[PDB]
């Protein structure tokens, strides 16, 4: 009877356009501190909107959202500010060389940085147009992981990566480096769902499944979707 709960949603319904159809309807879940929740579902299902509710950017019309803590958010827009790679990753936080190194290794940036003589000190322009798609994605993830937060909201960080790079980062970063952090990972990959503490599958704004992977194996659409 000591509770470890970090995020709760109870009977949550929300509208982006207050009057039409809800973007999220009757959503219920809870995440305990240090757990990984995988959020899956087709394009447009409401996955990012769910993260937005957690961040206070979308308010419910019904229900309650409970969370107290610092959030770090890795958006679908893999964005880059003018400045160095190092400056992009640290992004206004205090510098901790041990932490910085652990994050660049876990996000598979070691080999990319170590390529130039100027290492991670070379200035990027806004957009980081001289980087590869995957470099931009990894720098964006590294930024979110470097922040010292209580809840990590990782919105499909692996979209632009090849399947081998994605596997290595999911294992080193999400599963290992962040093992004791509360994480919500938007992903529909079945291998990732296996490793999650809990799973929420959304469909057209409603909950299609919520529970453990063993509870999912016992039941489908998810096997088509993943
Ligand atoms: N800020 C917003 N204002 C108005 N409508 C929005 C907003 N954000 C999302 N929507 C709409 O709500 C629906 C759900 O969008 P959302 O971004 O949550 O989907 P998603 O599950 O993240 O999809 P994807 O996998 O494509 O990223 C979409 O039809 C989208 O057009
Ligand atoms: Mg999205």
From Swiss-Prot:
Modified residues (Phosphoserine): 132
Impact reported for residue 91 to R: Impaired maturation of glycan chains indicating impaired trafficking from the endoplasmic reticulum to the cell membrane
Result when mutating residue 134 to S: In CF; decrease in bicarbonate transport; no effect on chloride channel activity
Effect of residue 203 to Q: In CF; strong decrease in bicarbonate transport; increase in chloride channel activity in vitro; no effect on glycan maturation
All copies of domain ABC transporter, residue ranges: 20-226
Lipid-attached positions, S-palmitoyl cysteine: 107
Compartmental location: Apical cell membrane; Early endosome membrane; Cell membrane; Recycling endosome membrane
Effect upon mutating residue 155 to N: In CF; impaired maturation of glycan chains
Expression sites (tissue/organ): Expressed in the respiratory airway, including bronchial epithelium, and in the female reproductive tract, including oviduct (at protein level). Detected in pancreatic intercalated ducts in the exocrine tissue, on epithelial cells in intralobular striated ducts in sublingual salivary glands, on apical membranes of crypt cells throughout the small and large intestine, and on the reabsorptive duct in eccrine sweat glands. Detected on the equatorial segment of the sperm head (at protein level). Detected in nasal and bronchial superficial epithelium.
Post-translational changes noted in the entry: N-glycosylated. Phosphorylated; cAMP treatment promotes phosphorylation and activates the channel. Dephosphorylation decreases the ATPase activity (in vitro). Phosphorylation at PKA sites activates the channel. Phosphorylation at PKC sites enhances the response to phosphorylation by PKA. Phosphorylated by AMPK; this inhibits channel activity.
Binding site for ATP 1: 16, 41-48, 76
Phenotype when changing residue 184 to F: In CF; impaired maturation of glycan chains
Record annotation: effect of changing residue 143 to T: In CF; impairs maturation and trafficking to the cell membrane; decrease in channel activity
Mutagenesis / variant outcome for changing residue 211 to R: In CF; impaired maturation of glycan chains
Protein family (similarity comment): Belongs to the ABC transporter superfamily. ABCC family. CFTR transporter (TC 3.A.1.202) subfamily.
Record comment regarding domains: Binds and hydrolyzes ATP via the two cytoplasmic ABC transporter nucleotide-binding domains. The two ATP-binding domains interact with each other, forming a head-to-tail dimer. Normal ATPase activity requires interaction between the two domains. The first ABC transporter nucleotide-binding domain has no ATPase activity by itself. The PDZ-binding motif mediates interactions with GOPC and with the SLC4A7, NHERF1/EBP50 complex.
Record: disease: Cystic fibrosis: A common generalized disorder of the exocrine glands which impairs clearance of secretions in a variety of organs. It is characterized by the triad of chronic bronchopulmonary disease (with recurrent respiratory infections), pancreatic insufficiency (which leads to malabsorption and growth retardation) and elevated sweat electrolytes. It is the most common genetic disease in Caucasians, with a prevalence of about 1 in 2'000 live births. Inheritance is autosomal recessive.
Subunit text: Monomer; does not require oligomerization for channel activity. May form oligomers in the membrane. Interacts with SLC26A3, SLC26A6 and SHANK2. Interacts with NHERF1 and MYO6. Interacts (via C-terminus) with GOPC (via PDZ domain); this promotes CFTR internalization and thereby decreases channel activity. Interacts with SLC4A7 through NHERF1. Found in a complex with MYO5B and RAB11A. Interacts with ANO1. Interacts with SLC26A8. Interacts with AHCYL1; the interaction increases CFTR activity. Interacts with CSE1L.
Function description: Epithelial ion channel that plays an important role in the regulation of epithelial ion and water transport and fluid homeostasis. Mediates the transport of chloride ions across the cell membrane. Possesses an intrinsic ATPase activity and utilizes ATP to gate its channel; the passive flow of anions through the channel is gated by cycles of ATP binding and hydrolysis by the ATP-binding domains. The ion channel is also permeable to HCO(3)(-); selectivity depends on the extracellular chloride concentration. In vitro, mediates ATP-dependent glutathione flux.
Record protein name field: Cystic fibrosis transmembrane conductance regulator
